[PDB]
DNA sequence: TGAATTTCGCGACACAAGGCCTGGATGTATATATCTGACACGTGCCTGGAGACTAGGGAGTAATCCCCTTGGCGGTTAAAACGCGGGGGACAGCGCGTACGTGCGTTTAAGCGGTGCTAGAGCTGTCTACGACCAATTGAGCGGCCTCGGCACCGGATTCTCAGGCCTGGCTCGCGATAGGGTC
DNA sequence: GACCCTATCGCGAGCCAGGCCTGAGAATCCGGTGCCGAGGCCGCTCAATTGGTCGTAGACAGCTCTAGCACCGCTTAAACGCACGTACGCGCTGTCCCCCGCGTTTTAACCGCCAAGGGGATTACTCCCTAGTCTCCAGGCACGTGTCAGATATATACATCCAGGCCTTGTGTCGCGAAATTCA
């Protein structure tokens, strides 16, 4: 009933201005997005529970990203998340 | 209907994975392995179907059964 | 048996048994030491028939007290070294009233022989 | 009549099938097998075609991975022809 | 006046926050966690799509199909390590033939 | 047809068998031959080959040397002939 | 005259004794120093509870024992008795660790 | 004092005993360096998660539960140090 | 200072029930604590995911039974189903 | 004011129903927890614990011992098919291994 | 030490070889031996056996029979002795 | 024609060689003393479990629509099944030299003991920014329609790839001669 | 210095390897034709947004006290290094049998169509199961104390290897019976 089709399309048009994507690949991207979201949310929940906490803040998300994503992807994702949070807070 | 998985099908599957020459005893062993794997997956799929009191096995039940066994499947969601 | 048996051996391997119908030739290491028979050749003469030559592998050893039998192709036996050998290239060792089998070493010298003669 | 030495046609098949992505198992026999297997656990079950296709995709991927591991095992043993012992060793090492 | 625009993102912050709230992951959810998660998802999607697009021009095609995604995922060390236990429909396999299989 | 001692002598090479091992040659005949100088079987074989395997010459010489009769000389000639046919 | 077993009987005795025993096979001090050296690479000046080091050693020993079981299976597959680095590499690659 | 090159602390007899436990009969001579590398990689990949868990808690001592959770993430659950 | 909870007494009672004259060391008791916690976590997580799949917000005995079927293999599954059914029937009858 | 008996006593269980119910409520597994679910879970846990402890006690009996040690638990678990399948990923501290030597290793 | 003719004669039983096949024996020596009556290899070995394998007697007889020299008689005696030790 | 001579074959006497009965050195499993620190038991307490009763929303139950699953028929093939020729790939046997197991003297650093301290884990107290909750908004995003071009498919060149026949060459086998050794 | 006998080189003839050239089959590149799904457009609607309040989760300040870290010394278990023996993996070869490539016959998969109804999705109504709160109370946790299970070590009974001593078996021998041949 709901998916991430339009956002994946916008990102694809942002990175490759002249390349399209078939429907089955769009469903694959939706499944991948759901999988990554579930993994990160579960890791953040476990991290919050281990510390006897009851709130999932950005620090838990950053720690989960460090734990899950390997190497360079972790550094890049941390940088992007920090920049996004800074821009959101500053405005 | 386990014989429905013909020898050419197993041969093509082996050819895709990089197998050059195939023995003659490979086929029955592969049939048994496929039977065991299908038993394991379909048991969980039928359990999921019975939990919702439905008489039809949906694709999401198969997807969840695969996800539980550690082999995530993309594209059939859902 | 209507065949007279005459044998002579100067080495450690003697020609033990010869099939009168040419199915096999049987040799034995009659010593207490293993005998190497690499590149050894056996010459089979059957009366006036042309000579048959069988060549052992370049490295081959018959241990002490062991028996090696060279089977003809028509015998239908299964090759099993070092005890059983089947000569697939030759259908039969041949027949006749004067069968002579000689064991020739790698240096072209005869060291063993058994001859079957019929009246 | 023209003839190819054995192995070369196998390499051509390997290239052609690795370049392609279609399913290597006929759909009707697999569907009949799946319906047969589900009969042992329940009687009057119905299957969506999408579920059967997903099961077929999963089985094909699992068999492809198992055959890759088996080929690695056989190549380790200084052999080029796979054997049931290779499959059993791969399944035992994988944890199955 | 959208949270994605405020953070300069493309993924929906509100949808991620709603999924976090409805998913029974915690009793309370922080304000910046959906923003950080959306940023991470955007970067991962952008990386995957960039690799897939680079793979697409290598065989003269112009549209991304599951084969392109499979090639892009299996051709990268980090992405393959991240998704080592994942099956992609219609994906195929990477061309990989052992040297001992090659003649001579 | 053939005496057993003849079969034993023909089956294997003489080597160093005594003259008494010859078929038809016994203790008295063997002792006489040894006294004459022919103390070994192969020594008799040399003289036999000198006479070119002739039956009459060899048997008559055997009679004149030790006193063997027709039967013993015939047996000895047959044994030596079979040995020559089998090993020589 | 001297009593000398055939090479392998001592190995069998070691196998039986070690499979019958349950104690640790790596001395604590070198492993602890190795763990501290590895840890200092990520963050400097970190402290370790003794039980944490014990748990790390237990996990490493169990992982190595399982890896060596798999590598012995691999070596036996090639009709050999001695394990080789290629056996360990093949076992790890099949397990998916590499 | 800065600690360096403690990988040699994993002695050859220790690796030999570990192999003897697993059923290995005869051991090569080049196995030891491969075992050292494997152990180094595994220890790095575990201590990384352990240190990350410790850092999230704003602590400077690595508790045993951090190691237990790090092993739990990688599919190797550990019984006996859970409390 | 702070109370810490564990399953020592219950495992001890179960052991005394099954084996009247056998003792359990402390290390084995901690191992049993870890085993109980791990199994409980597995069952609870599977039940939670199953309940979320069907758009439900309640964990009834049916979800627990289905999770037990999914997790425990073979004879253990049937035996646990029988034990849970008997326990539920006895609890509901009084 | 009636005399109070624990839910375990009502269900005839040794495990605590109340503690499991509290853990389920505090575990953030769902918004709601059923009444019979803690009873079912406690029964399952009791059965599993009884099975493991019985196997461990038999193993301890076999080797002349009278007290359960982690080696006994390891031997009991690894010698049962279903428990081994259930606990395939579990490492037992101070548990050792199963005594086993490959057939080819033995002299011919 | 040994000539090729010597090895060739020793490697096989004499059978029906001519007297010239003996090592150290030329065409002239062989023809003279044939004229004397010893027209075959085995006939010469008969003489060798008769003289009880004595080196001096055999070589002197060969010298007095065909005119062989020290070298030829030495070669002939050696070949005959080796043949006797290998087959007889 | 009978006596003498001779050869082949048979049965008691003596022999060595092999197989079975018994005892000592040897390492391996078996019973007992000791002690010790951990396990089992007994008790104070206090917080978590239990008992009653209420509201309210989650779920069960009944009815309906259509959809998509199942069932079945007709053809066209593409795929499957079977037989044959074969040459390639598995397997066993045999060196072999090189690398590892085994044993003994060496050292060196691990393990155990004992000590201090202080950095930091853990626990308690304050309160304040921060997130849950609820009414109104409205536009961003989802559902249905169209269209047209990227791609599937088919046909035709173009170059590539695999495989085999003919020619040139090298390498080996065998008879005769010029030179070497010995004799005279 | 001449003469007899033997020995290695020269050259004819045949078998095996590799290179040049061509042909069959295929992969590929290029162009034309059609099609149906992806991308865009428009209508619609309900979930994200905004504002404000309120209860509190955890962040800071501070204190205690504990165990991790640092240090030293003694003891000896084990790591270390050397040499030697042997066994073990690697290489090579020959045997064989068995899948692979190819061709011919078979068959049922698949596509397209039709037809019905089981049940999945949905909506509406009711009710009752459980979150929540207060009040009560006893079960299990923290603490202390005793005693015995098992580690530790020594002394003793039993299986195993190997050698000494006694009994059984196959064999060689020598005088004599049975048969044939030649000379007095």
Residue numbers in the entry:
A (entry chain H): 34 to 124
B (entry chain B): 25 to 102
C (entry chain M): 428 to 546
D (entry chain A): 38 to 133
E (entry chain G): 15 to 118
F (entry chain K), K (entry chain L): 2 to 89
G (entry chain E): 37 to 134
H (entry chain F): 20 to 102
Provide passages from the article that reported this PDB entry.
Therefore, these two complexes, with high and low mobilities, are not artificially formed due to cross-linking. We then conducted the cryo-EM single particle analysis with the high gel mobility complex fraction and determined the structure of the BAF-Lamin A/C-nucleosome complex (cand Supplementary Fig. 2a). We found that BAF-Lamin A/C IgF is located on the dyad region of the nucleosome, and each BAF protomer binds a linker DNA, tying two linker DNAs together in the nucleosome. The two linker DNA fragments bound to the BAF dimer in the nucleosome are perpendicularly aligned, consistent with the orientation of the two DNA fragments in the BAF-DNA complex reported previously. The side chain moieties of the Lamin A/C Lys486 and His506 residues directly contact the DNA at the nucleosomal dyad. Consequently, the BAF-Lamin A/C IgF complex binds nucleosomal DNA in a tripartite manner. We found a previously unrecognized DNA-binding interface of Lamin A/C, including the Lys486 and His506 residues. In the BAF-Lamin A/C-nucleosome complex, the BAF Ser4 residue is located close to the backbone of the linker DNAs. We determined that both the K486N and H506D mutations found in lipodystrophy patients decrease the nucleosome binding of Lamin A/C in the presence of BAF. Therefore, the nucleosome binding of the Lamin A/C IgF domain requires the BAF dimer.
